[PDB]
């Protein structure tokens, strides 16, 4: 029974999704897709607009077997960690395959990129080293090692993040020594994020353009962008508790978790650089908004989403030895299932004797300081839910057991 | 120059607060009115309704000349820790008289029991003692030995906390051989707590009856229950940062703080006793409301009140260790200007360079552990205050000047 895993966080599922999960089977030629999501907190740094289970609830339908999250210990962080977690979860889950996006549908630069470095490392440690020393930043002196090999006319622009999260999939299984093959196909329009909804032909728009057209208050626009599941779910969330998520709805958590917090305290956060707790502070106060607090913070050595990263730790209140304890993990502590179709279920009742780790369906099942952080952020997560709405979300987490799709016609059993 | 004691929490400042402050100039012949003042949070624990700059405002019209901070150190604590507190402050300020209101107009019971109960503090130990190995619990111990002696038709019913806080004035005043002459006058009508609005005449209703009339949406029900000053200031209040604040309001921020709280971290907050900080977490995520969380929450060793000051601990994040070391102090931390009238004004003026601690008006002035304290506790108040009204709130502990008004008619000169 043969697997092709996926690197996700769907927000929300859409068209291009399910033209992935289409085509990474066929591509692989696997009768089981596998996705890795980012739970309630993505990549990126901003909240899911919908809850991970209900995202869940669309896979399913839409041609994902299994759903399995993407701890947060993983999830929040800049593409290698990210890419390192994700991939040793599907490499955990024994799929052969490997389905990546991208601008191309060559695999073969991804591929040979990949061994360069890992074959020039040595010189590249010792070309920063030599760049460094004549004063240049880390970055800079990375940029210079780094085009002294590398540039020709190989390009893959290595910032196109499907291509920047491609690289370190294809790395992370080659440092990794993964019994796995990555595919890639090139995608199609709209833009790599931003823009807007197009004319027609399911055209699979971005999920930016999708979001805050949601947000931006139109649920039809974005139809034609939608499976059947997507919309029907979507709709039946914020029927449900009655929001749809933005980083903006958590900003009074942060003002009340900045208000809470010594300095001192404040630099033990993950991710809060060595004496910007100062900035941080100082900026809090007078920020009325979400923007406005990035844009007193914004810095060389902080993009706007790294700064994001950062803000949500500090909403989640993330330590850095917490961290730090759980990175050293060589591989992923536990799996977490957040649904199954019966194809899935069956191939995880045929694979569940191996997994080297827990297979988590309830959470009384078990503990560990990485799920404890899944737990927290899904706590947090559901803040600006209305009472007592919150209060029923919060009983999401526990008592909700792995959700079961029955793709010979449509059954939620439970 | 003579001025007298005044220790209030105005929520609001009513027909009865005006009546004492008369009462006070009146019966203990000093010509000026000083009201140490809990600030945003009070002694039961609750948030005040409005901002301590309104309330400042409704008492410096009322014929109240100076406002001091009570900090939320003594202020948001027991009545014993209260009044060593407050009375403390008063000291500083050297007010030549104190006085309070009780059920009763007669201290003479009140100074006859602190007396009587100092003369016998070697004796209620023992009892206490007795009665504690002999299997009772504390307080049935304390009850017991208190009884044995002083108990008779000689009353002073020691519940109708008027009498609670008196006694602990009274108590202070002694304790720290403070040249304070205590007085007292009765109460009349509505109830002590709760009930409602009278039928007319400038009755006085309770400060609550007034809240529970403006938490229903009512401020006209209570007009004959405010002075102009404090009906008016209400109004811009609301005006301004769009609402009064509630219990409830805060409900949002106990859940997150408590929900990236440790159970050892929980431990470490102030009036936490051991061992209760799991079924508080427990407590909080199936809690819908702060009414539903409050009953998990009850058991024999805490008073509802006390569990009300918990909440704002847990809220304001304040610890143990922290509270220990402030408490430790036998004297002021600081003198805290609130607001003056004229006459407030020539009083401090005179009596400034006798202060022994720092006048702080502006908060350049001088800087405290204590003072940090007083500070969270308002950049935690405003929380509840829709962005961007809840960022123009928080400016206002600094930049503002002290408030100054002229006794002779209505000036403001701000």
Known sequence: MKAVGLVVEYNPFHNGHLYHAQTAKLQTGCDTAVAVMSGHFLQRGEPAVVSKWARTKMALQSGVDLVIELPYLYAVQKA???????????????????????????IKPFLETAQ???????????????????????????????????HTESALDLSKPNNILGYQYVTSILTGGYPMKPYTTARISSDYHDADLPEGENHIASATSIRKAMIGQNLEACLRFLPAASARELAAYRKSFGLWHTPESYFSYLKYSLSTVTARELQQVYEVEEGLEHRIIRSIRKSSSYQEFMELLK??????????????????????????????????????????????????????????????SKLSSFSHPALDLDVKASRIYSLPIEEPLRTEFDLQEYGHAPIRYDEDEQHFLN
Chains 1, 2 share one sequence.
């Not at 979860?89 to 060559?106: P, Q, Y």
């Not at 810095?299 to 304890?325: A, E, G, P, S, V």
């Open 80 to 106: 290698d960690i990210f890419a390192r977690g994700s991939v040793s979860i599907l490499n955990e889950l024994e799929c052969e395959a490997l389905f990546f996006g991208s601008e191309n549908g060559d």
């Open 299 to 360: 810095t060389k050595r902080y993009t706007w989403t790294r700064l994001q990263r950062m803000n949500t730790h500090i909403l989640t209140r993330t330590k850095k030895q917490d961290m730090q304890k759980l990175l050293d993990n060589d591989k992923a502590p536990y799996i977490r299932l957040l649904g199954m179709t019966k194809k899935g279920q069956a191939y995880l009742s045929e694979k569940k004797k191996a997994l080297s780790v827990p297979l988590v």
């Open 116 to 150: 360069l470095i890992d074959e020039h490392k040595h010189i590249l440690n010792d070309r920063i080293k030599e760049e460094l020393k004549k004063g240049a930043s880390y970055p800079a002196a990375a940029a210079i090692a780094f085009s002294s090999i590398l």
